[PDB]
Structures are given as C-alpha cells and as structure tokens.
Amino acid sequence: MQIFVKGLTGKTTTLEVEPSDTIENVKAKIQDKTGLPPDQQRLIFAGKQLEDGRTLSDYNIQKESTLHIVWRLRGG
16 A cells, blocks of 8 residues: 655655555655654644544555655754
C-alpha cells in the first residue's frame, strides 16, 4: 500500500508504507528522499495533522493518500 505526497515542485513522490508502519517511520523515509531534518518536516492528511505513536489505520489514511510537505525554518 503506497501513497503519493504532494511536493513543493508539484511532483509527487511515491512512498512505501503499511497500516502498521507508524508516522515516525514515514518521516524517516522522507528524511532520506528530501534530505531535510525532522524539524523541517510536517505531515498533514485531509487537513488533519499527524502525530507520533499513531498509525495509518488511526488516521484512516488509505492508498494514494495525498499528504503535504511543509518546508519552513524554525529560525535561529
């Protein structure tokens, strides 16, 4: 069960996930494709904010679910 994430460039990035796969892991996968640090990553689905400890089955996230990558620096 893969998912498509809306990138800033508009290009979607397929990611491998599973009902068991927690968000913490997902952010980790992203940290590799985006190379961005965890403090610069944010996942939101259907306008709902995700949190660690939860799973896809909790957010009712299905396949081809459109996420949202928000890139912003917390400043110095």
